[PDB]
Amino acid sequence: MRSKRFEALAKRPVNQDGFVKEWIEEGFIAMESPNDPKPSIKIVNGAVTELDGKPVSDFDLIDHFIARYGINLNRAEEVMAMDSVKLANMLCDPNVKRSEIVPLTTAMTPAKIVEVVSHMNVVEMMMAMQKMRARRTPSQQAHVTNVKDNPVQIAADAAEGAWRGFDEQETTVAVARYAPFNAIALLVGSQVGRPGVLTQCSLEEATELKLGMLGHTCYAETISVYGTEPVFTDGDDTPWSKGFLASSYASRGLKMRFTSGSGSEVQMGYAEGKSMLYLEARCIYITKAAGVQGLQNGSVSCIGVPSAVPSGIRAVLAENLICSSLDLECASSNDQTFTHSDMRRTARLLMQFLPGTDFISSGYSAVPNYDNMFAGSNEDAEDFDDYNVIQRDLKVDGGLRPVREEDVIAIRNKAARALQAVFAGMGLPPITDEEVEAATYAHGSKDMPERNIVEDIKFAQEIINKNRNGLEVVKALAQGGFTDVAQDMLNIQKAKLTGDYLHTSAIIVGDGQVLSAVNDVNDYAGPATGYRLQGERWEEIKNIPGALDPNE
Amino acid sequence: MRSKRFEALAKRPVNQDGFVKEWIEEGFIAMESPNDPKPSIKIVNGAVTELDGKPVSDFDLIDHFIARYGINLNRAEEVMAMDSVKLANMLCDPNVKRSEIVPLTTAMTPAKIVEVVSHMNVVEMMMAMQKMRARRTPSQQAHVTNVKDNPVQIAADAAEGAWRGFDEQETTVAVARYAPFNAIALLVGSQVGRPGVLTQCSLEEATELKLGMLGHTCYAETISVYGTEPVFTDGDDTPWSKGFLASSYASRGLKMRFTSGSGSEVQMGYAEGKSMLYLEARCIYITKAAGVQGLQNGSVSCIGVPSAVPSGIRAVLAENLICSSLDLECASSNDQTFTHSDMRRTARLLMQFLPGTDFISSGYSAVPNYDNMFAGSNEDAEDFDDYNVIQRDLKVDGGLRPVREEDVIAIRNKAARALQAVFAGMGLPPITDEEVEAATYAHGSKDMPERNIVEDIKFAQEIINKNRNGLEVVKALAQGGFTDVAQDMLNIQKAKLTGDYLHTSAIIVGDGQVLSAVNDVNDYAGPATGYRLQGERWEEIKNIPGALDPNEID
Amino acid sequence: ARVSDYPLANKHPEWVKTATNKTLDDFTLENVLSNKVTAQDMRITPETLRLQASIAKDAGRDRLAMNFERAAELTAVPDDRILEIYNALRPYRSTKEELLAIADDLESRYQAKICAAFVREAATLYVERKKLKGDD
Amino acid sequence: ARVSDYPLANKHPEWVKTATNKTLDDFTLENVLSNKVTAQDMRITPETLRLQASIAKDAGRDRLAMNFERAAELTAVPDDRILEIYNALRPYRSTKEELLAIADDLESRYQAKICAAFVREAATLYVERKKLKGDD
Amino acid sequence: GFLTEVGEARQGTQQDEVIIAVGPAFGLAQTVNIVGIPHKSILREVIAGIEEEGIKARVIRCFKSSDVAFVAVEGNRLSGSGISIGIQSKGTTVIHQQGLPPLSNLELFPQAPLLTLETYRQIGKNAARYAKRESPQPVPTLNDQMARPKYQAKSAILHIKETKYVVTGKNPQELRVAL
Amino acid sequence: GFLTEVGEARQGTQQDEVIIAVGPAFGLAQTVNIVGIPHKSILREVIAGIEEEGIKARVIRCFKSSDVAFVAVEGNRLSGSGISIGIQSKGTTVIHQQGLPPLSNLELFPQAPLLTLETYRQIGKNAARYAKRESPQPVPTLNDQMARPKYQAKSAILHIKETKYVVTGKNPQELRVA
Ligand code: B12
Ligand code: B12
Ligand SMILES: CC[C@H]1O[C@@H](n2cnc3c(N)ncnc32)[C@H](O)[C@@H]1O
Ligand SMILES: CC[C@H]1O[C@@H](n2cnc3c(N)ncnc32)[C@H](O)[C@@H]1O
Ligand SMILES: [Ca+2]
Ligand SMILES: [Ca+2]
Ligand SMILES: [K+]
Ligand SMILES: [K+]
Ligand SMILES: [N+]
Ligand SMILES: [N+]
């Protein structure tokens, strides 16, 4: 008969996860495949004639783009000749400066840097990531969505997320034509919670750029790249169309990054027999080659693919490390559900949380996952207190902080009242006092009164059709009792004029201070150097609810 | 009116945990207290005359013991003059050999090494721990208990635990006089699951030594030490009584270690104003000074004290690192419940799991926690599949493996039958065929038929009162049709005659192969060096239940 | 400009002008509310982008700098034309002569020399990799 | 002995004899059932523990070796007396005189000189730290 | 075994039809979708949903691609109504329309594990109503956030397995469906 | 204020009493146990459990220590039957017997959060039954593995505060209970 021990284990949530054995021939292998090309490069008169065993006669569009733009040819032959274990050793050695490594790693071919990081265990990878992360200060990015596209709730949730510490926040839509409302609500709410928080509204590429041009977003992220030409082509793009789109955003003063992540190519069935990590390296080099400042990767929405196979979560840390080692900002996923097990998803998160990345998650859900319109994140709002407890336990700055319920109520109320004034001043379907109250105290859209969706969609569409721009939102705030929020909104728009926040890892902190890898240079050099959680920031992270005062 | 967001968060298990703000004056602070002494030493012709700001005239018994026996005085003044940040850098630098560090760290005073590791974040500490761990190969230790002291179940659970990969297993009693049965069942069961697994039965010191003298255990671990003289005195010992007990175990061929852990002293209210980590460092040096080869620490049963305060789980990792850096075997706790949250306890476990220690847990519960007679471990039997999945996810050898249900059923059955023969050959109260079946398929003691406790206790006490030794267990096995288990039981008794497994980190693998820090030297030197999960062992860890074989389709 | 010149908003706000020759200090609530500044005033200039490109180069990021130099050219290209060129670069959308015509127009109408070479490069490689109209 | 001589079981199993001069090969199932060997035969020797002490020294573990040296002496001390001496070393259990008599007995009756010195050291420091009988 | 080729699929000879275009392994090397629903039952329900609306159902097998959008594009080019339904062996489904860009669609069902036999019937119904130039309320599906990661890897295996039966340049075959 | 000193504690002479020894801050700086159970209801249940067995319950207040074993040891030297009950402010309790090693005991209750008012009374019964030379069954307590970590830190704080009221070299003082 059956062992009751094994019946008990059969019930465990982890055994509902999807697992598969490796299939090397088809590329269903996270990393360290015997099919991956051996690193190589040949250069004649400044042109690459061979890239990782492939002659230039056989280059696809990705090889051409990487060989022409993605590799520093000044030291490529030099670094190719170095022992890959020695290079991996340099990555995690505290006494080899990031600034000494970057000229070497940015001269590596895609196969070379994969070979280097594949010599590392996850402790070594984290030891390296804390050094190779571009921005000295780690940060965090949140999802702010709900299944009704309720704009009052989006504004209130965005204010709370900004109050808790997210420096980038991201929305998207359940119903496509709601998008202008979601974007405005996210931007207004974010500035109420903390002036300087950057916002994006992830959509079809043309609509998202239009909202940027109108001033209702601050950056874009979900512009995808892929690691084989068939998959890239089946997404209806090339490296050149993506590079042109990237420069188009910058020409409007909008920060942007690409999105990639391990497993996308084998998921589509066109892995060309290569490991997920090697193909993700090609995606990372396309990003580098396009001149894009950063990258959202770490499998992202494909996470069920590497997580199914051996060493898949290690491969996910590795692809984040390659990104940072190639001197790109890394928005390191942790933004998509992949497991039923709290144990398993914590281990997956800690790989990026413990060393810190530019954004530890590229989409921590700042709403309960039932409201998450990216189909659920690796962490959600009900995890906020656990996240803060682990920061305090380990003395690790994960970018967030404990907050008082009365402060959150007040900031959510202000955001909802500010958006109410925006909608009144702009002649949009009204936000009632009852809606402001509901959004103040809501956990999610289950707590929100239903809106007239037909009316919202008509007026949201007219924002696009009539080219209603962000200065009209500033005007509505300034004439509706919110000149303070109006000024913060205007200040976000003025940041697009300077180009400062276009740079690698840029966020805006304090009183409009841009903080990027240019002026917040990561200077890690071992213990007691580099970013350290200390001072008032440590006092903030210590102050969790429930800590009994011995003087009481 | 309440925020529904905060009502949702108020329901989360982590908010049932115990948290307190720091109380520096009373030592309720995990590490980095301004009250901890500044490192110092003075040495006159091999005698310490000053230790961390204290002149010898003011030494307590702990100072005396540490100063006389616990510090490498040959390089103490040299390492004292080195910059603590530089030393912390050396600890995590992959290119500074463990064999070059150990003469310096064993020469540090307690306050000095605490200052050194306190410069490190947890990533740096793990980077150092994978280098400073004494044994090259990481391992794991299990609890095997149940609320009934059912010996058939103990034998079956111990066999399953050895089959899964535990190289040390630990029992204790719900009812004191059951102890000899628990010990024999744990030993027989462990040897059935994998010959070489070491066993202990944690009890009051005299009873436990007596069972070792009788041959029914292989090692002892729960011999405590403490970091202030009042707390040590209130445990009714000194460093000299503990050091004598340590040598007494070795004089009988029995491996042993001490137990300590952050928070014990402030819990008793006599922290002398010091941080938990500094006082635990004193405990670590007491262990070193006694000549004890290893240490169970990482707060252990006091885990509710450091975990309640800031940086407490970091301090726990730091105390494990100090232990390994003092060239002691570290059985690094992860053996006591401290949180209602799966997220939080996973973070706490990974500090040791990711780099590896000599025993990643010093008491993973190999039974469901309701049967755990140490009042619950940080992981239990229902976590086995999560543990194996994370090993496979991260390519980390956490010392365990996935196993087939049919193999476990067969290994539990054999252990129950073997114990049945022992009880029948020694004339103990019988183990019925029904009990053998129930133990074979049980999850815990809820699945076991209830035994005659009055009767079991009677014959258990006769085992010690009549000095019935381990050769009678060997006899019963060889006479009851278990010649192979009899031979394995004899081989583990013969290991006590050579002294090989008395050394730092010793376990017994393969065919009676002692594996310790002496012949399994940790030689970590950065990526692609030291212990790596690879080869057949990686194939073993890959092979988790549920993994779909693509050849099933088409 | 060098990394010490960054952020421009801190180190050289006066260097930051708009396409309509406004300054950062012109963008006040008072001027927004009176329409003394409007959305057409609020456009980053090619001068600002070329300054950021210089800062990116000095920070060791030559490819990011090239992106900003392309961006500087594209400030002069109307919103609708931006999307047309992006679409034209998608696989199978354009003939080779249509892409070359986009590049000649970029160069001659907008002086977008770098972007023009970028599009001519795409045209050449789309021939070799069969990504032009009629190749699918 | 050196680390190259370890483990004794693998490198020099003949170096291991018991307190009754039995060899490792003498411990078979046949002899256990014959009672040719018994529990009194299965006791590690001071010679084996001093070998292991030398190996510990060669591995850089001087204090471990010293513990093995004490253990070598205590092999000759009966089980009951082991427990008596351990209890006498607990705080407030003994007078200075009683600990000194335990030490002299250790040295003169068992040749356990290192343990005797260990106990006399305790006696001296228990005076200093007031951990003798009557001090509580 | 319920599908037989009857010759190359031809342009529709009437405007009142919907083409169901299935992948190269559908009903052949694979016989169930991602969660074990039989292909025979899936096809039965889609056809029945089309025929309920008084519209004729025509089934073709596509060989040039295993991608559900391209499979459906092969169908919409031949459909007398311009409307097609593409179905992969793992069950992913799309309602497509001649003239739309290949990655666009009328309705997409991109989480195959969430489709029931009721869903497949309503998909047929909606396609037939699109063919009658109506605007049916889009078909609803039940949300499950654990479906994607739980089945993503297995879906990729099934898709790779079906892709092995792609034949470059081979025209779609019209299929006869067994009773 | 429901406890009142009435002079130094006398030693029991006949085997007719069980001594209740409480901590230096029991009923003074603290009035409830680790989980809020008042010291009045605690001391009432213990006395009621002792007098229910025909034994006279005498309450004293130890000062030399806050350790429950040492508090109880001070009580069993003055107990006429040699049986005492030590109780800290945080509620930890032990049944001790004169002549036993200080760290040994008849019954120990080392999880104060798991003690109910039914347990404090039942403790008084068995302690009285030990005085009558009988062999009562061990007092049962609920099992909760989360109780130790959840309350460990707070109970250390409560113990530290009561230890502040420890007067060195001060003999126990008998109390009068309302
Ligand atoms: C994983 C995913 C991908 C993966 C894998 C795609 C693949 N074909 O293998 C990657 C990242 C590669 C990807 C690419 C694209 N995706 Co996509 N994708 C998803 C996502 C997040 C989850 C689907 C899933 O995991 N289902 C669970 C599994 C078990 O069920 P399944 O039936 O096997 O799912 C398959 C399909 O969903 C298919 N698929 C995925 N994306 C797309 C897009 C289109 C147009 C088609 C026909 C099929 C398809 O891939 C899955 C695995 O084979 C959905 C989001 C959502 N809300 O569902 C978007 C989504 C389906 N994708 C979308 C888009 C726009 C695209 C791209 C066109 C983006 C681009 N411009 O590059 C490409 C199209 C690639 C192609 N030719 O199929 C849109 C489709 C909008 C619509 N209704 O037409 C969706 C709905 C997201 C959104 N809300 O906008 N995608
Ligand atoms: C943590 C713990 C300790 C800690 C803290 C002790 C302290 N006084 O602060 C440390 C590690 C220092 C320790 C030391 C000892 N402990 Co202890 N300890 C525990 C443990 C695991 C948990 C108790 C707990 O946390 N409860 C939760 C809190 C919230 O409730 P609480 O009422 O405040 O608990 C307090 C008491 O339990 C007290 N306490 C703890 N241990 C002991 C031992 C004795 C004899 C006494 C009187 C009190 C006592 O400390 C706790 C906090 O202040 C228990 C196991 C168990 N079954 O509970 C063993 C346990 C209570 N300890 C025991 C022993 C043997 C000892 C030592 C004598 C060991 C030694 N020889 O060194 C010493 C005694 C020290 C002393 N003078 O009090 C035994 C008691 C056996 C008995 N029936 O007499 C127990 C039951 C464990 C066992 N495996 O049998 N212990
Ligand atoms: C539905 C396809 C979309 O999913 C997003 N995405 C999520 N994960 C990945 C990934 N791993 N690679 C590429 N794109 C991804 C991206 O925005 C893309 O356009
Ligand atoms: C009940 C005290 C017992 O608990 C064990 N113990 C658990 N945690 C610690 C610890 N942190 N320090 C000392 N001893 C400990 C040890 O065996 C000791 O005898
Ligand atoms: Ca994101
Ligand atoms: Ca243990
Ligand atoms: K990829
Ligand atoms: K300690
Ligand atoms: N985006
Ligand atoms: N033990």
Coordinates of N, CA and C in Angstrom, one line a residue, chain A residues 2 5 32-33 50 80 97 124 126 129 284 286 292 315 324 352 414 420 425 439 454 469 505 511-512 516 535 537 544:
Chain A
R2 N 0.2 2.4 0.3 CA 0.9 3.7 0.2 C 1.6 4.1 1.5
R5 N 3.8 8.8 4.9 CA 4.8 9.9 4.7 C 4.8 10.4 3.3
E32 N 24.8 25.5 -19.2 CA 25.9 24.5 -19.2 C 25.5 23.3 -20.1
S33 N 25.1 23.7 -21.3 CA 24.8 22.7 -22.3 C 26.0 22.4 -23.2
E50 N 34.5 36.3 -37.1 CA 34.1 35.1 -36.4 C 33.6 35.4 -35.0
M80 N 39.3 37.3 -24.5 CA 39.1 36.0 -25.0 C 40.2 35.0 -24.5
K97 N 38.2 45.9 -8.6 CA 37.2 46.9 -8.7 C 36.2 46.7 -9.9
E124 N 28.8 32.7 -4.9 CA 29.8 33.5 -5.6 C 29.1 34.5 -6.5
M126 N 26.2 36.0 -6.0 CA 25.7 37.1 -5.2 C 26.9 38.0 -4.7
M129 N 27.4 40.1 -7.6 CA 26.3 41.0 -8.0 C 26.4 42.3 -7.1
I284 N 20.9 40.0 -23.8 CA 21.5 41.0 -23.1 C 22.5 41.8 -24.0
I286 N 22.2 42.2 -27.2 CA 21.3 43.1 -28.1 C 21.0 44.4 -27.4
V292 N 20.8 50.8 -25.2 CA 19.7 50.8 -24.2 C 20.4 50.7 -22.8
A315 N 20.4 29.8 -13.0 CA 20.6 30.4 -14.3 C 19.9 31.8 -14.3
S324 N 24.3 43.0 -15.2 CA 25.0 44.0 -14.5 C 26.5 44.0 -14.8
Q352 N 18.4 37.7 -5.6 CA 18.6 39.1 -6.0 C 18.5 40.1 -4.8
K414 N -5.2 61.3 0.4 CA -4.7 62.4 -0.4 C -4.6 62.1 -1.9
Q420 N -9.5 62.8 -7.7 CA -10.9 63.4 -7.8 C -10.8 64.8 -8.3
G425 N -11.5 68.7 -12.7 CA -10.9 69.8 -13.5 C -10.9 69.5 -15.0
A439 N -11.3 53.9 -1.7 CA -9.9 53.7 -2.0 C -9.0 54.0 -0.8
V454 N -18.4 52.2 -19.3 CA -18.7 52.8 -20.6 C -18.3 54.2 -20.6
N469 N -2.8 66.4 -22.7 CA -1.5 66.2 -22.3 C -1.3 66.4 -20.8
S505 N 20.2 53.2 -14.7 CA 19.7 53.0 -13.3 C 19.0 54.2 -12.7
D511 N 14.8 65.7 -3.0 CA 14.1 66.9 -3.6 C 14.6 67.0 -5.0
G512 N 14.0 66.1 -5.8 CA 14.3 66.1 -7.3 C 15.7 65.7 -7.7
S516 N 21.7 58.0 -10.4 CA 21.9 57.0 -11.4 C 23.3 56.4 -11.2
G535 N 22.8 54.0 9.9 CA 22.2 55.3 10.2 C 20.7 55.3 10.2
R537 N 18.6 55.2 7.9 CA 17.9 54.2 7.0 C 17.8 52.8 7.8
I544 N 9.7 47.8 12.7 CA 8.6 47.0 12.2 C 7.4 47.0 13.3

